[PDB]
Design a protein around this ligand. Structure first.
Ligand SMILES: N=C(N)Nc1cccc([C@H](CP(=O)(O)CCCc2ccccc2)C(=O)O)c1
Ligand SMILES: [Zn+2]
Length: 305
């Protein structure tokens, strides 16, 4: 039950943590909920930064995919590092003064609970589907970006089911609703996954390249170089379609086509030795090196608005 930053925490524990870290840091963190899940859990959002007028923001979510436990761990790690180093480390101090980080600790809460209780390898949501006993939609194929046109299934029984319609899932509708309602301020979108050690940018739903792909490639390149300084961990990077494989309906592509010009999917450790079942013993090293890339991106975005 007790929360630890070097262990994977269950939802009850993460929920208690969002309340605790917010009460302990009132001038640095506010908590709201942006929606409920299919099974009635609260989708918490943390706003991290020193409040002020007309602040730009960066949006980061974790836990799209239930089994990718290091993703959830990173969002929690980020929040503590922000509050611990504010006022002492120049860069984080400037970040929190000038912008807000929206941190969504766990999007697909229902699936995450399922990985703790029944099936460690679950990935989808846990919503019911008409006409079948098969459960769940892949939330990262459920966005309105070339929806269900490639790299996706129309069968609810498949792991890549794109859903009955774009934003059919309460969770993805809640996230899209929030982003749409905050487009004027959100300057970047970061979505945290594992595994494969990559930084992806648009597009995945099509082989076409984003208008600013040269810029996005240079930024990804610089970010993976920064990440490698700590433990030598090697990341690859590029447009999703060629860097992994085509897949429609992803939140990074959707956010980009909303006008959020800096949109990245992070795939964290490792490369397949442990895969989704990354040992807790690697949480600290993974989070620490990932922090460097996230901060590099953040500084770049701040210098380009
Ligand atoms: N919009 C996007 N970024 N779409 C996208 C493109 C390629 C891959 C993915 C995800 C990757 P993921 O988050 O589950 C991590 C997959 C890790 C992996 C890697 C190799 C073999 C088996 C498993 C997917 O397969 O749904 C999304
Ligand atoms: Zn994933």
């Amino acid at each position: 039950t007790g929360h630890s930053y070097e262990k994977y925490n269950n939802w009850e524990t993460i929920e208690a943590w969002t309340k605790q870290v917010t009460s302990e840091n009132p001038d640095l963190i506010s908590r709201t909920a942006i929606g409920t899940t299919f099974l009635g859990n609260n989708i918490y959002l943390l706003k991290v930064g020193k409040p002020g007028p007309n602040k730009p923001a960066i949006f980061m979510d974790c836990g799209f995919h239930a089994r990718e436990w290091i993703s959830h761990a990173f969002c929690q790690w980020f929040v503590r590092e922000a509050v611990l180093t504010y006022g002492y480390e120049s860069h984080m101090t400037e970040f929190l003064n000038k912008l807000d980080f929206y941190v969504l600790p766990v999007l697909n809460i229902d699936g995450y609970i399922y990985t703790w209780t029944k099936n460690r390898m679950w990935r989808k949501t846990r919503s019911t589907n008409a006409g079948t006993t098969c459960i769940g939609t892949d939330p990262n194929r459920n966005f309105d970006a070339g929806w269900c046109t490639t790299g996706a299934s129309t069968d609810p029984c498949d792991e890549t089911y794109c859903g009955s319609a774009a934003e059919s899932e309460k969770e993805t509708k809640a996230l899209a609703d929030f982003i749409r309602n905050n487009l004027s301020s959100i300057k970047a979108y970061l979505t945290i996954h594992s595994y494969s050690q990559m930084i992806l940018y648009p597009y995945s739903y099509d082989y076409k390249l984003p208008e600013n792909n040269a810029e996005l490639n240079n930024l990804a390149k610089a970010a993976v170089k920064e990440l490698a300084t700590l433990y030598g961990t090697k990341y690859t990077y590029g447009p999703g379609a060629t860097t992994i494989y085509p897949a429609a309906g992803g939140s990074d592509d959707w956010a980009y086509d909303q006008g959020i010009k800096y949109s990245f999917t992070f795939e964290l450790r490792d490369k397949g030795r442990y895969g989704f079942i990354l040992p807790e013993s690697q949480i600290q090293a993974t989070c620490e090196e990932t922090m460097l890339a996230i901060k590099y991106v953040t500084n770049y975005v701040l210098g380009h608005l």
